């Protein structure tokens, strides 16, 4: 994506044959794509699973379990821990 509404910039600014020469010449000044310089030296980028659980291949909209990990186990335990504290208050 891109700044503001991506879709709004995408619809406003589109290719013409007049812009076509300009769009290439601009790219050539950013020294190629610099996204086919990337996969060469990494010999294939993996996936994020280090802190994502629903990863990034979702076929519906991503959550924020992409920055967080499974908190139901911690909840189960807190519950049980809290019951001894209150029992012996």
């Amino acid at each position: 994506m891109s700044t503001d509404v991506a879709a709004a910039q995408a619809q406003s600014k589109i290719d013409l044959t007049k812009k076509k020469n300009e769009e290439i010449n601009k790219k050539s000044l950013e020294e190629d794509d610099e996204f086919e310089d990337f996969p060469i030296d990494t010999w294939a980028n993996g996936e994020t699973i280090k802190s994502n659980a629903v990863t990034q291949t979702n076929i519906w909209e991503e959550n924020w379990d992409d920055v967080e990990v499974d908190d139901d186990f911690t909840n189960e335990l807190k519950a049980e821990l809290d019951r001894y504290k209150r029992e012996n208050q």
């Binding site: 659980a53 629903v54 908190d71």
Partner: peptide, 9 residues
């Protein structure tokens, strides 16, 4: 399955 965590929260 994948909204299991999301609903807890």
């Amino acid at each position: 399955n994948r909204h299991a965590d999301f609903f807890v929260r």
